[PDB]
A paper describes a structure:
Obscurins are large filamentous proteins with crucial roles in the assembly, stability and regulation of muscle. Characteristic of these proteins is a tandem of two C-terminal kinase domains, PK1 and PK2, that are separated by a long intrinsically disordered sequence. Our study of PK1 from Drosophila obscurin shows that this is a pseudokinase with features typical of the CAM-kinase family, but which carries a minimalistic regulatory tail that no longer binds calmodulin or has mechanosensory properties typical of other sarcomeric kinases. PK1 binds ATP with high affinity, but in the absence of magnesium and lacks detectable phosphotransfer activity.
Of the variants tested, only the protein construct encompassing the kinase domain followed by 40 C-terminal residues (dmUNC89/Obsc residues 3186–3480) yielded a soluble and stable protein product viable for structural analysis. The atomic structure of dmObsc-PK1 was then elucidated to 1.75 Å resolution using X-ray crystallography. The structure revealed the kinase domain followed by a short CRD tail, limited to the first regulatory helix, αR1 (nomenclature as in 18), with the remaining 8 terminal residues being poorly ordered in electron density maps. Helix αR1 is amphipathic and its packing against the kinase is mediated by a cluster of aromatic residues that includes the conserved tryptophan W3469 at the helix C-terminus. The overall structure of dmObsc-PK1 resembles that of other CAM-kinases, e.g. DAPK, which also displays a CRD tail that is disordered beyond helix αR1. In dmObsc-PK1, both the catalytic (C)-spine (residues I3199, A3213, L3267, L3312, L3313, I3314, I3371, L3375) and the regulatory (R-)spine (residues M3234, P3245, H3304, F3327) are pre-formed in the absence of ATP binding. Finally, in dmObsc-PK1, the activation loop is in an open state so that access to the active site is unrestricted. More globally, nucleotide binding does not induce either global or local conformational changes in dmObsc-PK1, with apo and ADP-complexed crystal structures being equivalent (RMSDCα = 0.18Å).
Numbering used by the authors: -1 to 0, 3186 to 3472
The structure:
Amino acid sequence: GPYDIGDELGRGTQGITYHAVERSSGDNYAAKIMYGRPELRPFMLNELEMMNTFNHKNLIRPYDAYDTDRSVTLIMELAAGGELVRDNLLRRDYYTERDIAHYIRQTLWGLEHMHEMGVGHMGLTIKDLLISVVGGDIIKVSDFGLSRKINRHNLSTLDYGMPEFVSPEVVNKEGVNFSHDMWTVGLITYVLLGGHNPFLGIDDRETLTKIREGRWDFKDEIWTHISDDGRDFISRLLLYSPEERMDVKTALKHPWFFMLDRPVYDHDYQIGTDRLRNYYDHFRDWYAN
């Protein structure tokens, strides 16, 4: 057998991802092993097909696949720096708004590659942003189990997802467009900068009712230290009406990213990691259960 399966690296709704070594080379890969429920097989096959459709620096690449009667294993590119939040931001005492803009721009470049070929990601959460090398700053977007071709003139419902990162149109059982991904980018950006999810309820049902209602604000003190452009970027994505949201190419033109064209000086505001760490502990526990 070509792969030596080692320690658990992450887990999601379809299975657990492990470190894998290709024996014949010594090269390191990620091995996603499906939970033993046969209804997950279509999602594994969809992820394999989608990974083989993309070819972009900011999207995880496929490598190999095999199966038993019950379960599918996918061997894929290893993001050796781990998850952005768990393994990079939360290993620091502070990060900056400029750091986050750098990560989100790359996330948008990955999404843009998908949207250009008519595919929506459909399931983006904070755990799906990865870093390619230890200590690095290159983003890899992952988890294409829910990704699909979107016909903008013949929309369909999206019946699955993590409740803290779905959009109002998902909760309301309406057709889902490319603008759903853009809502989730605004939500991820809000979480990365302010360290909390503005729709979090006491349980999943209440979270969903808060998303259905669609109201949120910048009340926490941290937001007074985020730039006008950063708040404007979020506010042009977290809009109840899907057609009002920025599409991916408009988002890439937003003035928020102009700061990445200048250098990093000694005056960037330093954001502490405590809030994000508290939200991440909650988020991670959702996948333990």
